[PDB]
């Protein structure tokens, strides 16, 4: 059941055609989530999944056009014919409206019961292939759901939202952590239910609320400061969900261009206002292919951080990682270290759980790979300056401080001997003359009155080893002992 | 143009009439594939595709007869009229002979060249419509090809083989994997051609030889132990290709019966002797409505395995699954677990490629659904016996060993979190008393020399070996097993 105002835009023969359909849909009060996902799903299938052009399928044709130099030549876009898309579309709605009898669910006050939402969730759930590998690229879109009955984790969430729209339930919306997804609904929008699995397979929590996740201060639930989406933001989600990767080292430039354009569309309508990750994703895309007259990536990264601070109580980690990354790839060592410090400064007030494995890996790689490497490549510059700058030393101490504070209160230790080496290796990359320029205090007087670097640890472990750090001989044994504990 | 010897059999007013026509055809040096496919297409059409008796239709007539009880009533069969079939038949042979000019290609010795076969394939390729975004039933037949141009993947191959018979090329024959189809020609039959696609997202190997697939030890090519049909088997193939699915939960009781009789007919003429799936197919049918004075289902599954061993080096998977299935349905836990274990043993010697996703799903459903069911429905029969027979436990370990072994040396991993839980759940289904009764030896001395016990089992896979002790322990180290069942030197 498409509206005639939707069909009038088909067939879509190019990137711009798709962008146009998105602008159309964002215009309406409730953009058709299922329609937009199908389209992106259809387009991604031929641009990344199966690029071999069929020539004996009815309704399937390819649209030639100039490709950008260097390459030059032609590029072939999959023509999204109405007949294919509409048929896919009707298969989804048929499946949904047939399996869910709203009559059985006394939906009063324009508010969806918890039982209704569990039901819809279960429909989508029981529809999936039992066998597939769940960590596979390109099973995010409803195209993939209807075609292959394969959905990735956050896909299931998105699909359950899309089902609810198709059922006329305008009160069920997609909630997004920085690494998980569920559903919110209810009068105030204050009711939650899990609908998908997280991590390695654990589909356990389906149906329950997210109260316990928020309470245990895990990064997965962002202490409550997760994203609650509106329809417009759900479109932003699926645009971010576009996966341009063909293989491990190869990207479809059409999918890159298209995701980039859709984000600017969204950006301009201001729908990335409360979406730090989107803004960062947009910035990442601008460093690759900078579209002219648009803000520089740096500006975008900052918009992301601003957003997190205004709307998410500055409880998001990735906005700083996004920025850190930039300064690493541009060799801005001082700024690069600062951002990593800022990142750690956020994680400090969280408690590390098993569910949080993803950010752990990210922090682990920062501490034990990105930072050590960064310093080496900077010591290669001198022996032929950041290493002379005690700010950078203070940044590095602040980074570890965050990590130690993070650990405090956690039901699982963070730091082990793996970290010990690299701390020492990294520490021993700053002349003892430089390290000593950093005063590590408590502060003597609170506040102010109208009438080298300084630094203050917040963690036990780090303030416990206040001196070992500024000494001229790195006591490479007492540090490793103290960084680790029980 | 039909021969005179064939027309005298129309009109086909019933199943038995269709049988008779088949008998006739099966008694020649070349049974007409095109004639028999068309007839089958036709009958399946009005029997599953569109069961509504046309009001506007002139030449289509329907024959009633008594229906099987309990339901009862009368069952109306679509009369295959000579005019219609001849028409369709003329249409096809016309279309094909129209597109190929046999003189363009020098065919010396009665041997067909690669070019000729490429073309005949191309002619079928650019005539059909592929149903890319859906799986369409009832589009296997040439009947479908002419009517709708719709043709599924293996339907293409069969179409090239029929089109070649229509051009009177008696050398081009049908190659049959367990989940693919291609074409064999050439002097001895050692010429291989790809004519169709496989699944979705796989590249395009049309025109090439299946050498690479044999090489890479993928199940799609059976390491070489695939079927090369003779005409008689190609007929058996299209009989298997009969498709009684009306919808997803409803079967055409008349198409079942037609197929069951056609297989028994092919069986008696000895045309199923080198076709394990056909023998499996028939057996499943005999489980449903057993025909009297015939072999038991059990007997037929074995003949399928037997066949597999004889002609195909025991490199086939389905023949075991066919047996396993029957056992599960009879709740013969012991045989079922065994049959599954044998299935794994065969597979152990394969590598796993993307194109094999079909046998994957199938193993997965065994590991993570079927076996678990069996054992859970058994813990109940005890509380109210196999779950304390260490034989069974051994079967279960051999199973897993094969899958692990399968995975070894594959481009893609095979095991993931999804499997981990049910392994553990199934290990726990046997008391540690029983699981310890099983001894897992590597072997100390090679071979023997001239001048009681419980189950003994040797693992072939590094994965199962490295976790031999964890399996027999009384405390099932749930966590450690799961960890080790997964691995990545990738
Ligand atoms: C460890 O070393 C380094 C790390 C980083 C770095 C830089 C940026 C990031 C953030 N990565 C983005 C990529 C993108 O997929 C973002 N994700 C997960 C999302 N983007 C947009 N919307 C969403 S919604 C969501 C939750 C879900 F998936 F729905 F459940 C997740 C999500 C996360 C992570 C790491 N950069 N540089 C490094 O070294 C130089
Ligand atoms: C996984 O759990 C269970 C599985 C099974 C089971 C039982 C039987 C099978 C084999 N299925 C048959 C059905 C039938 O279509 C057979 N097919 C594919 C063919 N039959 C005959 N000829 C051919 S030729 C061919 C390849 C092609 F199509 F030509 F390209 C395929 C093919 C295969 C597979 C699994 N049975 N029971 C189970 O639990 C009880």
Residue numbers in the entry:
A (entry chain A): 2 to 385, 402 to 459, 520 to 528, 548 to 582
B (entry chain B): 2 to 385, 402 to 459, 520 to 528, 546 to 584
Which sentences from the paper describe this structure?
The scaffold protein Menin, an essential cofactor, is a highly specific binding partner of MLL and MLL fusion proteins and is required to regulate the target genes of these proteins. Thus, the Menin-MLL1 interaction is critical for initiation and maintenance of acute leukemia. However, small-molecule–mediated inhibition of the protein‒protein interaction between Menin and MLL fusion proteins may help ameliorate MLL1-r or NPM1c acute leukemia by inhibiting proliferation and inducing differentiation. Here, we report the development and characterization of a novel, single-agent small molecule (DS-1594a) designed to target and disrupt the protein–protein interaction of Menin and MLL1 to inhibit leukemic cell growth and proliferation.
For crystallographic study of the interaction of DS-1594a·succinate with Menin, human Menin with deletion of residues 460–519 was expressed in Escherichia coli and purified with some modifications. Thereafter, the crystal structure of Menin bound to DS-1594a·succinate was solved to reveal the molecular basis of DS-1594a·succinate-mediated inhibition. The structure contains 4 molecules in the asymmetric unit. However, we focused on the chain A interaction mode, as no significant interaction mode changes were observed among chains A-D. The structure demonstrated a number of hydrophobic interactions between DS-1594a·succinate and surrounding amino acids that likely contributed to DS-1594a·succinate’s strong inhibitory activity. It also demonstrated that DS-1594a·succinate forms a hydrogen bond with Tyr276 and engages in π-π or CH-π interactions with Phe238, Met278, Tyr319, Met322, Tyr323, and Trp341, which likely contributes to its target specificity. DS-1594a·succinate demonstrated inhibitory activity against the Menin-MLL1 interaction in the subnanomolar range (with a half-maximal inhibitory concentration of 1.4 nM) in a cell-free AlphaLISA assay using a full-length recombinant Menin protein and MLL1 peptide. Our results demonstrated that DS-1594a·succinate could reach the target protein and inhibit endogenous Menin protein and the exogeneous HA-MLL1N1-1395 interaction at more than 30 nM in a dose-dependent manner.
